Amino acid sequence: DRVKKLINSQISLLIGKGLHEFDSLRDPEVNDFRTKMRQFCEEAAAHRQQLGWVEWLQYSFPLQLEPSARGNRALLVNVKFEGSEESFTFQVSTKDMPLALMACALRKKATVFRQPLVEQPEEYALQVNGRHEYLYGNYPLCHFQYICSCLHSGLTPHLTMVHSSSILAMRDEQSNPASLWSLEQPFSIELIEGRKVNADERMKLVVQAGLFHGNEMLCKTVSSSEVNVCSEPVWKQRLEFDISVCDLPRMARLCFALYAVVDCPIAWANLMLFDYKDQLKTGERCLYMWPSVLLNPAGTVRGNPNTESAAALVIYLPEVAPHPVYFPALEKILELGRHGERGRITEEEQLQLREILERGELYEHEKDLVWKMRHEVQEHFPEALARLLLVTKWNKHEDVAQMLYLLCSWPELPVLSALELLDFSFPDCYVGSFAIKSLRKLTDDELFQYLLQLVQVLKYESYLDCELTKFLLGRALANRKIGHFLFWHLRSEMHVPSVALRFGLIMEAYCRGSTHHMKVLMKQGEALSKLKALNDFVKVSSQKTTKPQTKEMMHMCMRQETYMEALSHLQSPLDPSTLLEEVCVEQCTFMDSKMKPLWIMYSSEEAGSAGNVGIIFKNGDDLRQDMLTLQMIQLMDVLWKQEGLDLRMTPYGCLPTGDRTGLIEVVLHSDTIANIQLNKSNMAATAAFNKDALLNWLKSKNPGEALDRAIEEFTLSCAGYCVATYVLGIGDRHSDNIMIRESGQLFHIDFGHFLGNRERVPFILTYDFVHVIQQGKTNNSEKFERFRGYCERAYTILRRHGLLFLHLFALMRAAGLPELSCSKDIQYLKDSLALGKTEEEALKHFRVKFNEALRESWKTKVN
Ligand SMILES: COc1ncc(C2=CCOCC2)cc1NS(=O)(=O)c1ccccc1
């Protein structure tokens, strides 16, 4: 049928790779994933097309709640009905529920239309005007992110009563069309030859090989003999590893490194000793090696796709038996692990276990005590599983059976513990499956908060079909917002040839699950395609002609029918809730920096003031570190909000969408501190002293009694960013990367440097901001000390959740960020959060650091 061919060409267009390239690989593991995941994703599609209307609202328009609500006061609301142009303004309470507001809107409509109404508030849902956002459920109004937002900014909520029949019509329009353990032989392989090798002919070539189970070496690394450097080196030898074949763990990977000697790395390549169907690998293997920067165990176990250039390493995995040798089944493993011995011991050794499991590296004798007491670890300290898995001898199949027997009876762990187990230092498939089992209780909101880390964890995976891929795909097919961001996180990495196969295969599986959503994502990629061409034209044009003429050239290019069709009426890749309707070509522009980023403005007749939104298209710079930094700041704001602390933060969206390409959400009514401190003449803010400019600017935007609230929004946000930048190690802070909103809210932009990357970043305190906190006064210790308390109270909330940040940053090592790769980078966080110390000692240390920042600020007050 021409529908399947059309869908296939559309999927190929969307994921940035033709589906024909997957079939051309003639790979059983690739094709068996494509069938298995297509079946799974079409099941989800059918389940979804039969959902109730409230469950389809939960799929498409998941609730956006205030972090305090998860797990009185007068309010003016405007409610219109779908199709109608007349609306009703009424004053309800922040503690009233949506159903009461719907009953009140149906009463006003029944009185206005002089008819006794049959419809009931149970048949309706409230849409945020011109938005893919809905208010529903038994939650008071103030609990919704939209109503709470309106309260802070003084604006009036505009809602539309959508009927159950119109909601079902959306659902209907959006339809998809119709034995190893008895082999004590030492492990060995044949190093046959090497092809396309480029190196200095003065030197010699060596091949180093190690056996890994995640990070720990299964045995000592072995090396080949030094051979003369050439394009075709030949060893023809047998390297022998000090490990039995029966003792090979299921997740064992043979890691190779090709290099030149007289240190000079040329290439690296890894492979799994067992295939995806559990069969031990035998035969001739060609390893298309990856360039080097010596063994790389964390690197992928798949060949370099560029075979017309990559250096090859031809090896032979010897046939250990006259029959196919598979990895033993769980029943065979549990039966062997069921016959161990429980460690009965005195309170003296029990005192050490109760201390070293709560208290971090271990001593050799301490590991002997953790393994001996493994049964007591399971029963009394179930959250110490990660310590026990690290003391388990993975190079001993009998010790792996003893561990797996305890794991299979181990109780489900809390999300914080499960997040730790996803780390690469726990590569066992059963340990990953148990960790996924304990993540299933994650709400859509927690899942969305750690989605970026879970996507990086896919890079650590050894096989295509994994529990994490199925978990992520299942949650994405059940929630259109998870699906949206899962698509973009994978799509942004298609240019990386090591993840392109897996990421493109998951994106195809998702696309089968939702034909409609793929067409919405295509519309987004179409706009990004024109933004790329539009940015290029601006880069070339701006270097020859002036800024006003290049901006008019940009507006002419934008006014072409192709650009008007592509750039308008789309969901925002930065927020599916936000509809980018009419491009306001007049207000679009670009910045004066080397990459000339585009500022695209949008408006909406339906959404009103909410519809006037902006996006920034950036091409040339990498946005991955900004996205992570902003996500961590967002996390801080959630944690602070859950303890009743609202520091008025501004975690705007940042979305990488391709190769050095991405979008940033524009924060309207905001300016940089540098622009405000330029002190232009004939402005409502022209100062006598430059220190007054920032405060005068606030006075113009916030007249009379509004200034009091504006100074308080500034102060709260200052305390939030001071702590955030100190904890995260953000440096390169200057007037042009600190912005302020007309409301008084301060915030940071340009997050290219973090984790002190490498000098320890001190606590920063600017006298220009201290002058605002002090309300213009020289001495105002009441206001300044209120601010020190906001810092202290925000810092101690973050320390309480310090393990969550550490576990998230550890998973993020997989992203390959230059300022995030080794223990040294994440050491910065342990220092900033002072996690080794007590709450009194860390607070004393934070006070000394804040005081040392105040003395530096007084070098400006002395002037
Ligand atoms: C890292 O680059 C950025 N990061 C954030 C923003 C934002 C701005 C205003 O709205 C919230 C986001 C903008 C940029 N990039 S830019 O070149 O457009 C820019 C730089 C400095 C001042 C204003 C604009």
Curated annotation (Swiss-Prot):
Residues 590-596 are annotated as: G-loop. Abundantly expressed in adult mouse spleen as well as in testis. Isoform 1 is expressed in spleen and lung (at protein level). Isoform 1 is expressed predominantly in leukocytes. Disulfide bonds: none annotated. The modification Phosphotyrosine is found at Y363. Residues 338-513 form the PIK helical domain. Keywords: Adaptive immunity, ATP-binding, Chemotaxis, Cytoplasm, Differentiation, Immunity, Inflammatory response, Innate immunity, Kinase, Lipid metabolism, Nucleotide-binding, Phosphoprotein, Transferase. Its main location: cytoplasm. It is found in: Cytoplasm. The keyword Secreted does not apply. SMART domains: PI3K_C2, PI3K_p85B, PI3K_rbd, PI3Ka, PI3Kc. CDD domains: C2_PI3K_class_I_beta_delta, PI3Kc_IA_delta. Pfam families: PI3_PI4_kinase, PI3K_C2, PI3K_p85B, PI3K_rbd, PI3Ka. Disruption phenotype: Null mutants are viable and fertile but display defective adaptive and innate immune responses due to signaling defects in multiple cell types including B-, T- and mast and natural killer cells. It comes from the Eukaryota. Residues 584-858 form the PI3K/PI4K catalytic domain. One of its GO terms (cellular component) is cytosol. It catalyses: a 1,2-diacyl-sn-glycero-3-phospho-(1D-myo-inositol-4,5-bisphosphate) + ATP = a 1,2-diacyl-sn-glycero-3-phospho-(1D-myo-inositol-3,4,5-trisphosphate) + ADP + H(+); a 1,2-diacyl-sn-glycero-3-phospho-(1D-myo-inositol) + ATP = a 1,2-diacyl-sn-glycero-3-phospho-(1D-myo-inositol-3-phosphate) + ADP + H(+); 1-octadecanoyl-2-(5Z,8Z,11Z,14Z)-eicosatetraenoyl-sn-glycero-3-phospho-1D-myo-inositol 4,5-bisphosphate + ATP = 1-octadecanoyl-2-(5Z,8Z,11Z,14Z-eicosatetraenoyl)-sn-glycero-3-phospho-(1D-myo-inositol 3,4,5-triphosphate) + ADP + H(+). Belongs to the PI3/PI4-kinase family. This is Phosphatidylinositol 4,5-bisphosphate 3-kinase catalytic subunit delta isoform. The lineage of its organism: Eukaryota, Metazoa, Chordata, Craniata, Vertebrata. The gene is Pik3cd.
